[model samples]
Target: MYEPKPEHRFTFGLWTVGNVGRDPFGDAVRERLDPVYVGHKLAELGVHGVNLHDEDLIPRGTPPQERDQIVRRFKRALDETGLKVPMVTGNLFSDPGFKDGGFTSRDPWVRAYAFRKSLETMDLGAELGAEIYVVWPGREGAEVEATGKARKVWDWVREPLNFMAAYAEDQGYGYRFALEPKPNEPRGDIYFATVGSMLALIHTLERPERFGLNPEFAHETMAGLNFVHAVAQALDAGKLLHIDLNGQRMNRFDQDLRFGSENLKAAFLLVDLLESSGYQGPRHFDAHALRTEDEEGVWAFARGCMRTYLILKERAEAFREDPEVKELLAAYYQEDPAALPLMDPYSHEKAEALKRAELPLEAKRHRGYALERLDQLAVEYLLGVRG
Candidate 1:
């Protein structure tokens, strides 16, 4: 039977600036001070960290000196509020200079510009005391026929990242990096839109010592993949750097909905997996509650999204505690024989136990929760826990 420890907890953070569109009263309700207030609110709620972005919220092209100052101020704010700035991100694709793409651009100068700025941001992040820097390429592929130079673009990307990681190490930061993937949005196709693609890029760079991955939930859903499964695959590969969370309507562009809005059951399962895996990092929200008339309303919505995660997390824990689930899992593992036995209910417990024991400590914890929840659900629905 799998059981989670009481310390199994999820951290929460905001991605970009919270959007509180239109309603004039919105500004008064929560100033930029409101976001700071929200950070404190989240800390009080027991969240672990907050991820900040370099875009509309933080301002583009903030000089290195000024950017450092701002990050320090933000850090100070979080300290006063008792929040952690665990991860920092660069909006390499959102700006006009990246229209043809940043690292993948054909223009040498443009590629140089992108990495230079990224290096600067990484420096700022180090100064601000960030642990990881995320790189989400919004425009790194072609919509039309490749101008016969796709391979070149791939090489262009690998070069700068390799250089940046080396540079960061040279600077003594030794901070890890995460490359986020998206199916499509600003571009008809993105270079690293799937876990496979991300792995390929990581291999191309061959810097496992420094670079890993940060898969966004909505992006995974948009790419027609199961968010939890995708994450599991990353974990198996020893490449899960961090995760960006939000719910989404399947097969659509990234919506970044409040957690569990569209797939409550699946979200619960995902939470089960995260907890079982012993993930103690920030579960940052990269969501936007569109259709809200007021700006403050967006923050309220984001806050609600955070609360939703907390609720689901608790529900998952309760689901795992059901006794029927334990019997089902026990019986299933006791009888089955297969190569990937964990997927088969009729698998042998010895083999399954061995595999579970081999997982990273964090992963082992997640596996426990997942098995417990599945058993609980099975017992209640099939074995009649109530009856």
Candidate 2:
């Protein structure tokens, strides 16, 4: 029942499962998996596609002939296994040059280099049939705010994206850019550090319609922010272009734990929201195996991420279909038809009537919403006590 299927639209990043258990304090615990191997393995696990960074599939500075050969090998695996590449990103943080920032770098040369890499990544993604391009400004932040760079960084970050959208249109790449937001980790603080911040930036772009959000579950949880709420806001805004599925505990360094491993309840709610909201984008797991495990553990981590999502998705379907739960929600949103028209858009007649309408200051004071009961039912469902 928990088996992942192609219809689930699941995906894993090459950098995610291919992560070799490296950390700030230690070297890699396992050997790197090749892009061909990852594609075949993910397809074997019934995943629909695989995502990648340009460097993940083909390393930087590789000769043009060698890059063509490497991509051909990976494409052979995809063709043999019927797997696809639906999304791709550029590596902005790994190089030492981006230690300060990438697009927001103080030097014009660095920004130019970053922009060129982005365009090249788009070219590569188009070659791989990827339509969604995710832009993660991983190093676009400050450790020391004394340089007065913060103010200009905002404009710096905005300029490349405007130009990039034009480039996508100009090249017929048809890429819908997904902006990823993280509070911190690679930097002391990252600009556009939340989904809300990303949304604000999207509006100022020359082509706001081309940009949306790829909110990661772990990024917000690391800051003790409500990821489900943030995702709900993204969905409500029609800006959920893609999503990164993983688990993280509150206020911790990014764990990127297996999906539904650390926080079951939040994971359930997130799945329910996505499944209910007609979010048909790729469910990309941007996480890795625990550093404590061996190569076997990496596959287990990938399996666990997909299995947990399937299980939670089943539970979300079951409980949301429960009669009591449906009735409770119905009542929670129930309203008197007579009173509803009083709050319609302002007009001369409606405004004058609302001014004379009976304002219930005392009668509404003692009413209870029964939210505790509704929440309790959800907990029971997550705990396997309810349907």
Candidate 3:
């Protein structure tokens, strides 16, 4: 008997559900929704949590009193409906002042403004008891004609993050910073544009342990990279603080489709890796509904995102337990002593023994076949094929 228990918790961005479907060529298709109402709706749908930008809950330029009131209302709704705010971020890219960039901007005042806004947002996140503070830096890049020297711009990006990390430490905010990566969007190219690039940036930070990566599915696939590989790198570095689950086709625009919409196999593999890694952060969905969708369709899109993840999670568990798949993996690595080694690297005798070991490189070549068979088994499980 297979039990479909998806222990993974889920969260959806308020911007995803509250999006008015406005684009460059089209007017708003759906009505603007209040964040309070969206919270109630998501809670009613059984979502575990919600994420938001500072402006999503409170108007961008609202007065302090009014902003506090709005937050109180939203918090009340969350408490009443039993919803958690797993993360919060600042909208640094949308303002015109960030046309050049935000953290990496050339203008000193603009950069300072961006830093102040981020600090303010982090303060709000702290007040909300959020676990992560995300910084997308969506406009922190340049067009072909306006590109600057890489080193200088890279330094500019590093300084503010270090400043923020120090501030968070001194202020007693328990939440960690999550640096998100995207190849491009509003800008021709984005700095810290990939998981590896962000990881490199993290190493340069004054307090490297204070920050982590928030890899998004559509963002990686949009750049024609393997999303799972990006997550794997973050996990390897022990900096996978958060994640964004969405769907997009390789080499295509950031479609931000519902989960499992574009590549079901990749989605399942990603879930498998996440589950195997024992990632305890919220499985946040940073996708948007299609422009063609109305209010009802928007709810359906949200529901589908959660439903698809749960279904894939079930498939991933099944793949792990399937006897044939387990045997294939075991047999594939059986000949490699490292697969289940008991050698002590610090022992001179063991080291010399390992050095004296000769390779059987001329033996059979079954590696490719083993991988192919394992892949086929996973696909069969995904397709509901069983013995």
Best by TM-score: 2
Please identify which of the two predictions, 1 or 3, would achieve the higher lDDT against the true structure: 3
> TM-scores of the models, in the given order?
0.78, 0.98, 0.92
- lDDT per prediction? 0.69, 0.91, 0.85
TM-score ranking, best first: 2, 3, 1
Clashes of each: 11, 0, 0
- List where candidate 2 sits over 4 angstroms from the true fold: none
Residues 1-387 of candidate 3 have per-residue lDDT tens digits of: 222122447888999898898887889999999888898888877788889888788767799999888989988998898788889999998888888889887789999999999999899998888989998979887775444455578888789899998888899988788999999987777877899999998888888888999999988898889988889989999999999999998775678888899899999999889988999988988888999999999989988888888788777887889888888888866665552243644677666766777645556543355787788888889998852
Best prediction by lDDT: 2
* Model 2 lDDT tens row, 1-387: 788888899999998989988898999998989788888888888899999998898887899999999988888888999998999998998888787889999999999989999999999999989999999988999889899998898789789999899999999889999999999988889987999999998999999999999999999998999999999999999999999999998886899999999899999999999999999999999999999998889889999999999889899999989998899989869888868888878889888888899887786698777889989999998889986
Q: What does the lDDT come to for candidate 1?
A: 0.69
Overall local distance difference test of candidate 2: 0.91
Q: What is the C-alpha RMSD of each candidate to the true structure, in Å?
A: 8.8, 1.1, 2.8
| TM-score result, candidate 1 | 0.78
What is the Å distance of residue 259 in model 1 from its true position? Answer: 0.6
- The better candidate by lDDT, 1 or 2, is 2
